[PDB]
Write a protein that binds this ligand. Structure first.
Ligand SMILES: [Mg+2]
Ligand SMILES: [Mg+2]
Lengths: 201, 45, 201, 32, 284, 150, 284, 32
């Protein structure tokens, strides 16, 4: 809904690092739901066929995740979970352009970027902005930001938390403990014969 | 003057060679910290 | 450490999934239509153009059966700046005139009007409800006096997508959305078993 | 006697940010 | 005429005189904090200047007594938030500039007491210009050079053994500096901010001499007791015995080359180009 | 298994040659010796960088062992012998060419566990911990193998 | 007599001439890409040579007009995939070699316009040999040196204020280079591949002069308006007013020592050893 | 007058690989 207008002309970038990120991507998800008593397969035929035709496989190139979401009951919610699992791991352009201004800009804003050495001349969505003083760098992440070891640890941590809470009755009787804290200072001072002590405990 | 001629324009590039700071990069990005601390020419001794 | 954690949590996620459960399948498929824009004012081509997000939304919503956009006006303005996907209106309107439809080919719509304005920097197409479809601009202001302005929309398959296609009839149905010309909107889905590769024909 | 008178500071943030693409790589190579 | 370096009630005049046509005063100006872009699609780079600049003064001169030389060494080495003010006797500079000893440098001051000269000391100062309203800190440490009225030989004492340095060819170079202070960029002052730290300084004595007699006994007494033994937490006691008016200092040799014995073709004696001691903790 | 290739690029023209899943092969030769195809795989990351004026394209590719890593055992092998479980698992649960001449189990036990739902490489490494500590993988052409070590 | 350096239709002849017995041409050969093993159980290392070698040329010469010197600067600085061909007038070299400016250097070309020497320019060029079929790129960027016919003083303008540099002792050194190009190893042939980049170049003007009159006013006007103010993303306008036939450019001082004021014992004036400006974003 | 005339690029992979021995160590000291 917003465009930054100023852009990044070919004279206004001065570093870039632009990948397509595809090491996480998979092409089949199977989601167990309904207390684990029904399943749905979400099936990306294009990547399965392109890996087959590319590598010369005997049959379509399946790469799978299995999920269980035992409290999900409607099959269309188990499908939408499988589609979200594929979509958020799918192959996309990403990475950074380094420029100088853009204090008005935010993630979700649109910007024209041109980088003639790299064949880029497009409107991108800004996924993130870093401003560094000192070096005077504004670093735009474009299209989509994606993590490193923190995406691994976040997917594990999210999964462990989902399983940790799996049996909990959410309408259970509920109780409260208030944590509160106060302290008394006691100040010693010692006077001997009109001479104050130099240190105390 | 004979010794000074060779000397002065040796003492000059001695500073040029000695005073160059480090500028390390990983994968195109600078990793030297932009600590805003000054340094200036040492005493001539 | 990460792979032993990952294997351990995966083993617990699937604990109690019935592996003889009823399976079901969702197939994921992609097709795309390019609507290429070209704009001619008095024999001068526009130097930049956009099919804006409100036009993309209009064709999207029409494809859901929510009714077609009636293209009503060519609009002209004073301002080359801010040209982007997110433009909802011209930078500064100066005039507008009623369009005439022309359908010169199975995949093309042309909208034409005759117009008089000095200093035109921008052109657009407007739906009767005020929704902009197109903005296009010139590097140097154009003087129009009883001159024709033509906006031409051309529909194509996106040949970037793999093993999916918009057929010639699908691309014609998108023309017929842009024209409000009784489009063959989607009403059915088919599955088959001939694996012969996709083509527009 | 006239002749005789003629005689690195390294940014921990930028290292750890730059190496992220490489630190995660073996785990991606092993799936998850 | 003459250049004054001062801090509150303490003041030193440094003559700024030299032989012939030597450089007395070099002042340098710079922008260490401009960001000239290393790359980008234009023929010439985009730039941004957005911080205080550098100004340096290098002063070369001579002092006419040792007492003033020790006052200068102490004045430079001292940690104090009281501004160090330099007065330059040349019309291209304002009447006072506030300064720090050279911003990151182990040798802000050098004093040379060459052989064959009396009541002459060669002075070299490097000073960084700093904003007069922006001298900051909490600690306060007055430096003091030990002094005495004797005239004995310079003595190096370690392991209960004392070695007298030969008078023959004896030359002394002393360097002083405050490398642990921080001089820092400021957004839109002209000059930088100065952070005075009550922290470790640099103070080094270098000797050169030629051993002419009892040569093995002299050199071996030094190298056995100082170089080949481990000195622990302590070090050499270096005592000037009142030469140059100097007293006794605790010190240690440092690094790969603090002492060297040189033998030349056709010479029946040994040259010491350097014997170099850094002053160590004894200000208890 | 993986490979990394570093190239120069101009105007991003080489970066367009490497869409995710495209085949890459690395051949090697020393001296006048003939080319050996030492790596075959598919692109998983393409990255292009400003490196001190150079436009460096770095392409990273994984190989066939990912199709054992990223698939799960679908049938139940209780009461199959290990040579039958290898034929069952590889011929349905992974897109790899099966050939019974390449599988030679050193101690052909019968599986008591159901392996159903385990990752294929993880199940094969269990069959190899039973049997005789055996080597397995995807070999020459695209055939699976499972055979005695050394 | 002359070496010829050319790119398509543009050509410059450089007289390979110098005083007495100075070096006119140095050609260096090397193998940067041999792997010599740092260890292993042999007395002598195993090695592998498997890549293109390095050949470099240093040319020293003189030019007899300023116009040709500007053509040479523009020829060297320009980005084009059109091969830069060098012809060497000596039998140890082939009739033509394809070249890049020195592979990673800020100063590939230096032009010196020293005091006294009317209609003489010292040229020092450094060139890397590259494979003639392996000049690669996309962008062309024709470099230009602005020119005018005046005879005015060299002027430095910043903050609406103009300083005229003294004529007395005035010398100009201009240096040019293409550090953002890549010269890269290839496995099968003698010479490397050359990647031409439409990216930031190096272009530097160094002045040297002696300031004889109105000395505080002249030096303070320079130091206040250039060195003590923050210049933003603009900079100095540096204008030659037609000296050497040069016009006007935007530029900035860079780094720790781009300007020095030097005072010598017994002299009633200030020397400026260097005043350095790097050319900045300007073209459209 | 004749006398007067006489006047690092660091590989992100190899840092990420070489440090692996040490990055994993605190967790090993704590079991898993
Ligand atoms: Mg008390
Ligand atoms: Mg168009």
């Amino acid at each position: 809904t917003v465009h930054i207008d100023r852009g990044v002309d070919n004279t206004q970038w001065f570093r870039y690092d632009i990948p397509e990120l595809g090491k996480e991507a998979i092409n089949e998800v199977e989601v167990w739901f309904d207390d684990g008593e029904e399943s749905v397969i979400v099936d990306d035929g294009t990547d399965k066929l392109d890996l087959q035709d590319s590598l010369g496989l005997p049959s379509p190139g399946t790469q799978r995740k299995e999920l269980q979401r035992p409290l999900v009951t409607d099959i269309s919610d188990a499908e939408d979970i499988g589609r979200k699992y594929l979509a958020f791991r799918n192959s996309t352009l990403s990475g950074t352009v380094t420029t100088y201004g853009l204090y008005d800009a935010e993630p979700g804003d649109t910007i024209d970027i041109t980088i003639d050495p790299r064949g880029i001349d497009e409107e991108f969505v800004i996924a993130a902005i870093e401003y560094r003083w000192g070096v005077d760098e504004t670093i735009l992440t474009v299209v989509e930001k994606r993590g490193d070891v923190d995406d691994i640890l976040s997917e594990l941590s999210e999964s462990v938390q989902r399983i940790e809470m799996q049996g909990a009755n959410r309408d259970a009787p509920k109780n409260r403990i208030t944590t509160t804290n106060a302290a008394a200072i006691v100040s010693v001072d010692v006077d001997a014969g009109g001479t104050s002590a130099d240190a105390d405990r | 003057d004979g010794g000074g001629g060779g000397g002065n324009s040796s003492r000059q590039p001695f500073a040029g060679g000695f005073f160059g700071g480090g500028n390390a990069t990983i994968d195109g990005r600078q990793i030297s910290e932009s600590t805003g601390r000054y340094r200036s020419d040492p005493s001539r001794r | 450490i990460l792979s032993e954690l990952s294997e351990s949590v995966q083993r617990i996620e699937m604990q109690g999934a019935n592996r003889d459960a009823p399976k079901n399948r969702i197939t994921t498929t992609n097709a795309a239509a390019i609507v290429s824009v070209d704009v001619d004012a008095g024999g001068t081509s526009a130097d930049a153009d956009r099919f804006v997000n409100d036009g993309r939304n209009a064709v999207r919503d029409a494809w859901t059966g929510a009714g077609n956009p009636d293209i009503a006006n060519i609009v002209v303005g004073d301002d080359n700046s801010g040209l982007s996907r997110t433009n909802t209106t011209l930078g500064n309107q100066t005039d507008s005139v009623s369009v005439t439809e022309s359908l010169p080919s199975a995949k093309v719509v042309e909208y034409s009007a005759t117009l008089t304005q000095s200093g035109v920097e921008e052109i657009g197409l407007e739906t009767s409800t005020g929704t902009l479809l197109t903005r296009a601009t010139f590097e140097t202001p154009v003087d129009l006096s009883s001159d024709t302005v033509t906006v031409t929309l051309t529909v194509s398959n996106d040949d970037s997508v793999s093993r999916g296609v918009m057929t010639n009839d699908g691309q014609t149905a998108v023309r017929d959305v842009l024209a409000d010309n009784s489009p063959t909107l989607p009403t059915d889905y088919g599955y088959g078993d001939d694996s012969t590769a996709v083509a527009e024909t | 006697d006239g002749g005789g008178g003629g005689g690195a500071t390294i940014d921990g943030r930028q290292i750890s940010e730059s190496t992220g693409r490489y630190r995660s790589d073996p785990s991606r190579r092993r799936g998850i | 005429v003459d250049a004054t370096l001062s801090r509150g009630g303490t003041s030193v005049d440094i003559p700024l005189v030299e032989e012939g046509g030597e450089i007395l005063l070099s002042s340098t100006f710079g922008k260490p904090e401009v960001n000239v872009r290393k790359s980008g699609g234009s023929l010439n780079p985009r730039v941004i200047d957005s911080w205080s600049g550098l100004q340096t003064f290098q002063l070369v001169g001579k002092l006419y007594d040792y007492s003033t030389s020790h006052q200068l060494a102490d004045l430079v080495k001292t940690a104090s938030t009281t501004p160090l003010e330099l007065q330059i006797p040349q019309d291209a500079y304002p009447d006072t500039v506030t300064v720090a000893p050279a911003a990151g440098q182990a040798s802000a001051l050098t004093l040379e007491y060459p052989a064959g000269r009396k009541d002459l000391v060669d002075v070299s100062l490097s000073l960084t210009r700093v904003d007069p309203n922006s001298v900051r800190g909490v600690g306060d440490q007055q430096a003091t050079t030990p002094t005495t009225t004797g005239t004995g030989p310079v003595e190096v004492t370690a392991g209960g053994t004392t070695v007298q340095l030969p008078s023959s060819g004896l030359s002394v170079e002393r360097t002083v500096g405050r490398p642990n202070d921080a001089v820092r960029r400021v957004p839109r002052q002209a000059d930088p901010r100065y952070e005075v730290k009550a922290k470790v300084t640099n103070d080094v004595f270098t000797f050169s001499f030629e051993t002419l007699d009892n040569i093995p006994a002299t050199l071996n007494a030094l190298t056995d007791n100082v170089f080949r033994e481990q000195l622990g937490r302590d070090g050499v006691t270096l005592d000037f015995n009142g030469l140059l008016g100097l007293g006794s200092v605790k010190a240690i040799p440092v690094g790969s080359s603090p002492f060297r014995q040189v033998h030349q073709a056709g010479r029946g004696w040994v040259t010491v180009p350097t014997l170099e001691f850094r002053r160590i903790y004894s200000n208890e | 298994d993986y490979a990394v290739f570093k190239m120069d690029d101009r105007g991003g023209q080489a970066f367009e040659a490497y869409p995710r899943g495209t085949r890459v092969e690395a051949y090697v030769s020393e001296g006048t010796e003939p080319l050996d195809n030492r790596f075959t795989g598919y692109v998983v990351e393409r990255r292009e960088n400003e490196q001190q004026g150079a436009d460096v394209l770095e392409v990273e590719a994984y190989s066939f062992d990912q199709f054992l890593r990223r698939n799960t055992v679908t049938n139940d092998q209780t009461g199959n012998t290990i040579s039958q479980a290898l034929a069952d698992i590889i011929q349905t649960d992974t897109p790899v060419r099966f050939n019974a001449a390449n599988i030679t189990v050193g101690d052909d036990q019968e599986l008591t566990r159901s392996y159903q739902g385990d990752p294929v490489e993880n199940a094969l490494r269990d069959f190899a911990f039973k049997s005789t500590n055996e080597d397995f993988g995807v070999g020459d052409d695209l055939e699976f193998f499972f055979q005695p070590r050394e």
